[PDB]
Design a protein around this ligand. Sequence first.
Ligand SMILES: CCCCCCCCCCCCCCCCCC(=O)OC[C@H](COP(=O)([O-])OCC(O)COP(=O)([O-])OC[C@@H](COC(=O)CCCCCCCCCCCCCCCCC)OC(=O)CCCCCCCCCCCCCCCCC)OC(=O)CCCCCCCCCCCCCCCCC
Ligand SMILES: CCCCCCCCCCCCCCCCC[C@@H](O)O[C@H](CO[C@H](O)CCCCCCCCCCCCCCC)COP(=O)(O)OCC[N+](C)(C)C
Ligand SMILES: CCCCCCCCCCCCCCCCC[C@@H](O)O[C@H](CO[C@H](O)CCCCCCCCCCCCCCC)COP(=O)(O)OCC[N+](C)(C)C
Ligand SMILES: CCCCCCCC/C=C\CCCCCCCC(=O)O[C@H](COC(=O)CCCCCCC/C=C/CCCCCCCC)COP(=O)(O)OCCN
Ligand SMILES: CCCCCCCCCCCC(=O)SCCNC(=O)CCNC(=O)[C@H](O)C(C)(C)COP(=O)(O)O
Ligand SMILES: Nc1ncnc2c1ncn2[C@@H]1O[C@H](COP(=O)(O)OP(=O)(O)O)[C@@H](O)[C@H]1O
Lengths: 347, 49, 459, 88, 104, 320, 98, 54
Amino acid sequence: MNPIIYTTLIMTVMSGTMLVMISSHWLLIWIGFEMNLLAMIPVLMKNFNPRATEAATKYFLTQATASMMLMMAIIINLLYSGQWTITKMFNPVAMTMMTMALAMKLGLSPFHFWVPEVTQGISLQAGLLLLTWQKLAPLSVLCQISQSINPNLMLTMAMLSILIGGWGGLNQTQLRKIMAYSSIAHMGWMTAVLPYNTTMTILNLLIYITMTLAMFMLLIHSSATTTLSLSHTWNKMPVITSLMMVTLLSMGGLPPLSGFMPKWMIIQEMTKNESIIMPTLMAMTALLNLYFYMRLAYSSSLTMFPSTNNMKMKWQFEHTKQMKLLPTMIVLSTLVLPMTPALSSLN
Amino acid sequence: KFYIREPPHGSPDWLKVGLTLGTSVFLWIYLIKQHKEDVLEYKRRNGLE
Amino acid sequence: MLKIIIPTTMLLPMTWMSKHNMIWINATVHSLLISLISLSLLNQLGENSLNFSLTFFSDSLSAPLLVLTTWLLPLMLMASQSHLSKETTTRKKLYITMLILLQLFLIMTFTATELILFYILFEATLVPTLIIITRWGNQTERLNAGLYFLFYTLAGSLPLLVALVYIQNTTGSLNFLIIHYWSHPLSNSWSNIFMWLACIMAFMVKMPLYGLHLWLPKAHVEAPIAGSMVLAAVLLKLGGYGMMRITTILNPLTNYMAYPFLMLSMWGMIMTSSICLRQTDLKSLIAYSSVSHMALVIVAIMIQTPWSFMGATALMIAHGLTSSMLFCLANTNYERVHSRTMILARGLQTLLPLMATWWLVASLTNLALPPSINLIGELFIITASFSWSNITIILMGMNMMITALYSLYMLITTQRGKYTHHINNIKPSFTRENALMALHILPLLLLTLNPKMILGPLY
Amino acid sequence: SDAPPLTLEAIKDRVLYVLKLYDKIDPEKLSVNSHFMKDLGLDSLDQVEIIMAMEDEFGFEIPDIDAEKLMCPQEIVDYIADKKDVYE
Amino acid sequence: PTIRLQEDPDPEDENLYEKNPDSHGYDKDPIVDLWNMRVVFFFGFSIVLVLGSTFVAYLPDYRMQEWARREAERLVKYREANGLPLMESNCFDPNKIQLPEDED
Amino acid sequence: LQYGPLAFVLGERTTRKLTETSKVITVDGNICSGKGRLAREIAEKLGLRHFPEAGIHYADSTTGDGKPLDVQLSGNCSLEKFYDDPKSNDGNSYRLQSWLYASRLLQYADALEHLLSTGQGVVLERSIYSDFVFLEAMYRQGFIRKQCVEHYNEVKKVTACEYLPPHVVVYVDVPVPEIQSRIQKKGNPHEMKITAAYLQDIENAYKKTFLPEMSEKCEVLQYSAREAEDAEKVVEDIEYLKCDKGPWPDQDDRTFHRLRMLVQNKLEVLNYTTIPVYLPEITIGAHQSDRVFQKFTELPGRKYSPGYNEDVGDKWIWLK
Amino acid sequence: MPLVYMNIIMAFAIALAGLLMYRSHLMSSLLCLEGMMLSLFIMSTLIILNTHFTLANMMPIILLVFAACEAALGLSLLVMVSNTYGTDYVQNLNLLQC
Amino acid sequence: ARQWQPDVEWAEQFGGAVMYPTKETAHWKPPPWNDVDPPKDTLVSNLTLNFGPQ
Ligand SMILES: CCCCCCCCCCCCCCCCCC(=O)OC[C@H](COP(=O)([O-])OCC(O)COP(=O)([O-])OC[C@@H](COC(=O)CCCCCCCCCCCCCCCCC)OC(=O)CCCCCCCCCCCCCCCCC)OC(=O)CCCCCCCCCCCCCCCCC
Ligand SMILES: CCCCCCCCCCCCCCCCC[C@@H](O)O[C@H](CO[C@H](O)CCCCCCCCCCCCCCC)COP(=O)(O)OCC[N+](C)(C)C
Ligand SMILES: CCCCCCCCCCCCCCCCC[C@@H](O)O[C@H](CO[C@H](O)CCCCCCCCCCCCCCC)COP(=O)(O)OCC[N+](C)(C)C
Ligand SMILES: CCCCCCCC/C=C\CCCCCCCC(=O)O[C@H](COC(=O)CCCCCCC/C=C/CCCCCCCC)COP(=O)(O)OCCN
Ligand SMILES: CCCCCCCCCCCC(=O)SCCNC(=O)CCNC(=O)[C@H](O)C(C)(C)COP(=O)(O)O
Ligand SMILES: Nc1ncnc2c1ncn2[C@@H]1O[C@H](COP(=O)(O)OP(=O)(O)O)[C@@H](O)[C@H]1O
């Protein structure tokens, strides 16, 4: 693909997301989703390799179905009130349809099946974009209509996403499927606190985005998409594996790392609303994510796996293209807990 | 020495170094001036001085 | 209190800017000086604590713990520099960084005024410990051990967090002074029962309490020497300190919720003490003696009397010193014969006469020979337990009898009898090892002359 | 899961079923060691049809060579065991 | 090759006494090892162990034990001369206590 | 400005650099033939950059200083000991073959980068496309196992598919007895232990497989020993070729941009040479890996990036 | 709500159901996507005409436009899949698992 | 006298398609080293037509 065409497709994806983010009319939000998907499909197929075609087809079918249910919910809401403004969604059937459409777009359980397949079928740069930028528009819509959201349905899907992401990650040797299941669990954490406090949802999204960017850039730096391929990196660039281990520990949510701040901030919020069982189950379930992060850390950094002879040749060459925002992303994803009160700047 | 002459070497890229240092000092000067203005405005509004 | 924290933080850049052959010297000297500075916290009041600032305070319970924590770092550095000889420079500095970070976290943990900050530091102590165990342990089991260490602790402490932010939402604060002054009774309800369990089980797993003590014989055995030293001497006492701190909010609910834990402790004392009698691994025997000793601290904290609290403080300090010394003594033999089997190397008193004297003194303090502070703490707890119920003397008495049996057995197997014929690489003791033993044992004996310094806030 | 661990007994049962399914062979007369040409009076063309029936039965191509020697059922069993790597 | 990889043989441990018969067991370099020994001994046994123990022994009585003994002596003397009870059953005065209305 | 998407957006294309003289030419042939002198003379006549055959220490010459490194830190294989003991149980044979294929891949990437950045043609001795003739001869003589051949084919499948094969394939055909006599005359004591069956297998691989599928994408110029010395005839024979059979005329500026982005960044070129397939001949244990890597880092110009080594005369480091 | 509105909503539900329950051909599912778009167009046009919202009269046309972009997208993908397998069966899209 | 580090038999546990192999899942295979599957050379038939005689 031509670099100018790639640039304009990326700008169209971002423009669709921003159109969703600045619109007050439901039709413009729908148009933003459509425009985002239209430019998103060719980015997933940048390298042809039929697995990418499969991932693009699955993604298109899922997102088109979600768009249709979203439009139907918009029309039902209009029928029961001649309103186009995005507000508290005067009709409850329309609200259920809208919540299901947005849950399909985000990949919350049980609409979660597509995320591991599409992520495994695309490249690491496409996976980075899919797991970071694509969540902004649906979550920005959910923040706006959160007051009319039914807690029982949203929280059921949140608990299901946390459980399913934790269970699915345990069985994975491929790094992109591990990232997908981690994404499902973090989406569940984001949407569990949404009916209570949207500032906590935004804070969790930002911390998850910086952690995911750091992890994906570290996986791009060491061109590894499998556990065994990543296990060779200690013998070529030890610093990369050390930073990967610290980022994995942070993603696990262990204090005093940055990953801990969102969970700590969500549990507290849920306790102010007399929700005790829900945060306890969520916190205990996140230990599955921690386990399959610790297993990767064992494979890549805390022990040394056997290497190959040709690796010697790689000792003579340097990483040519540098990612300028990787150091900032690593520091932001690890050493940011002491500045937790700054979250008040998000409301 | 080296086989390929390794173009970025003992004479550093002085334009980039100058731009980096200029940006740092410009940011610092702006920040000190901003803090002085903030203190003066805060004292003016609160009837302190 | 920053006059201790900041010098500890300066140990990191000092270690990273040192010469390749000077890291051990610099780290040892400056950690010893930090211990010297830490000795000033022993000047405690009789009525309230030393409230340095809104964030940090020191009490008669946390001051001896702080002194032991700072004193342990030089001993760990001395014990580590032998088996890390062939290591690269940067990995040596990383190991020393792990130890310094652990000390920093522990120092802040013991002095935090607010329970959430205490929780955050008490959980942060996990990362350096796990890295130490799973990166510098010697065998393949060290990975599994790490997992056992990680998930036993967290599964206990995740409810605790949920309890703590719950409490602040109803009482308004988690500051310990406010918590103590504005204390209110706990009603007898299912919600209060589960809040009691959430506030207690996290600390119970750290002790550990018999039944959830499985992680310990793995983690202590597979860890490197400094890892096991810090795990036994300080990390086990985090549970005791936290339980002592959090018990104020618990009353009067503790009177009936303590029964299952008292039964588990008073029976698991016998169970683990008897397990020590049939243990083919010497380091595993030393590890199990720790569970047997901490059961007594659990009993003392649960029965909630001034004599029991004094005894628990004294026993925690004495056990820290004695268990660290025993782990070092076993490591001296391991670095010779490269096996932890107790019957592999015998008759060592013939070949290593002064290390045999060290072994004898460590075994004597382990079985609480009077007037050692091991005995002081044990006897105070036994007297308080007798007040709680006379029948306890039977269980307590039995434990004492068993403890002496596996201690001297450990002494007779490794030091007496005849040396195995095939082994011929048993070199004379180094000055480093002898000094490491002396710096363990001399403070222990010196604490006998001033026991009020280790008897806690109830003295 | 994929196909079960086929054994020699299964091969023999299938081969004998195929042979007893052939019109030009009376069923109870044929044995495992009966030579096709001598015992059953079968011509060269008949053998070709039987081998093709084996290829349909077991789903693998038996060349013209290595089929000129499978002259009794037992040799067919041995050939299929060799090709599929079955020993017990 | 019936080996699964190319690997170094496991090396045998080094005896520090072979090259430094008075080795102290701190380091391979004799000078660095000797200074490690001297610095550990001086800063552990001479500074922290002796001076720290002396400092702790002579700590001032901030626990107020002698003060409490003096106050107790004063009150015992005062009460005995007076003929008042040596110790009082109630720490807090009854006059300042407002019990609930009635016993039923 | 290093070449990249931004430089492609603003102007620069590679189709404008091609001047009908690009002509990636490889000059193959068996051992101890005259292909080296023929290649140098062809590069001299046509004004093309010549590439001497990539050996064990080829990668050393393109990085740091061109001085070869120790065999322990580079290669970890010996051609001399392959001749001494072809069936050694320490895996030297396939380790040598796999390292040599990696070196040939790096050389092909360097040659392609030079051509695509300057427009000047390149002459190579062998390439990744003819490397396998040495592998087959190794396998037919029983020097390597079948697993080694499968691993070689796996590495070749994911690497050789990313490049354009050469325009001109020159083959120098010299019979086995003549190269045998040349070997006996050269004087190298290790090289005389090459059996006739080994050279016959190399020729069989060259003629049965390599040339037939090389000749279906571009014309192949075969020559004998005596007419190979006549370089001007070969050069003018190359001058009158009708290159209409390969994918080279089927290349656009975007495909050339992708190829050029690949041929720089040698780490991406060598990506799949170290795939986690654990064969004993090439797998190195963790302890040896750690020791040898630490030994490599202690080399005078290897601890840091090229411009940041104070101990090889770098200066103004604190301002870079 | 009159019977016509429920008939349009039932048409949308039948199409959504048709989309969800896959048979073999990919094109059969693209047709159900088109049907869902048609049902939405009719529903919104009926609501807009009934309430006499004049400005909203342009939104179904817009709704039609992005219907084509979604169809043209889908057909494009259907080409590539077919070019890989010589068949548009959804059974072939099983290279990636969960 | 040497710290234990993983060997090939240890490393091969993570080389599978899934961490826990299952009777059904043991027949899953790992993806190719590049994400490129072998080209499915599907026989797209050419239509055959009779042009003439009539
Ligand atoms: C609550 C407050 C906080 C809010 C937080 C908000 C969210 C935070 C971030 C969320 C997550 C972000 C994730 C980003 C993923 C991006 C994916 C990606 O690029 O790949 C990774 C990429 C991989 O690189 P690689 O694989 O090594 O490179 C190989 C190439 O890909 C090989 O490819 P090639 O060879 O083709 O190379 C081409 C290359 C080289 O580039 C070129 O050559 C340039 C050529 C120029 C061509 C010009 C064409 C112009 C014609 C097109 C016009 C289109 C119009 C569209 C609009 C239509 C409107 C109707 O171009 C690129 O690589 C990508 C170009 C990117 C273009 C960006 C376009 C921006 C559009 C903005 C839309 C919004 C507009 C307003 C809309 C209003 C509503 C309507 O590396 C990274 O990006 C690392 C991560 C970077 C993330 C940045 C960190 C976050 C942001 C930090 C800065 C501050 C942010 C906050 C700002 C606050 C406001 C001021
Ligand atoms: C191996 C190491 C594990 C750690 C050990 C932890 C031990 C936890 C045990 C908790 C101590 C007590 C819990 C609750 C107190 C009483 C429980 C019950 O048995 O007593 C009766 C409770 O009544 C009934 O029995 C209800 C309980 C029956 C259902 C619970 C099942 C318990 C079975 C044991 C499960 C094993 C525990 C550990 C799980 C891993 C009391 O009679 P009642 O007057 O009516 O209730 C008064 C309580 N009020 C005031 C709150 C109302
Ligand atoms: C090798 C040969 C061995 C035998 C030969 C040796 C010769 C004999 C030497 C041994 C002396 C025997 C001891 C006899 C007792 C006399 C000492 C006693 O008088 O001192 C005590 C004083 O001891 C100190 O109080 C205890 C020292 C504290 C120990 C701290 C260790 C240093 C820090 C190291 C870190 C370890 C971590 C610890 C964690 C808490 C008395 O306390 P106190 O009743 O008041 O004093 C009254 C007068 N004052 C108050 C005015 C001072
Ligand atoms: C290494 C293993 C250690 C295991 C430790 C796990 C046990 C921890 C104890 C329970 C944890 C959850 C307790 C929740 C925190 C308490 C806060 C609280 O007070 O909330 C209660 C609510 O309490 C609960 O909901 C807790 C119910 C249990 C939910 C999760 C079940 C966990 C399993 C229970 C049994 C296991 C506990 C003992 C096991 C010991 C370890 C083996 C009342 O609040 P309100 O709703 O506002 O009521 C007043 C106004 N209506
Ligand atoms: C749909 C129906 C339409 C029909 C299609 C028309 C088919 C026409 C095909 C004509 C081709 C021939 O004749 S091909 C020529 C065949 N003739 C020979 O081979 C001569 C020697 N004879 C023999 O070998 C044996 O008699 C023999 C019986 C062959 C078996 O041999 P075995 O000893 O090894 O069993
Ligand atoms: N790909 C290879 N595999 C194994 N051995 C090779 C390979 N390439 C070159 N050699 C060996 O390197 C030596 C020189 O190669 P050769 O082309 O035969 O002679 P020269 O290039 O010096 O004219 C020979 O001993 C040859 O066998």
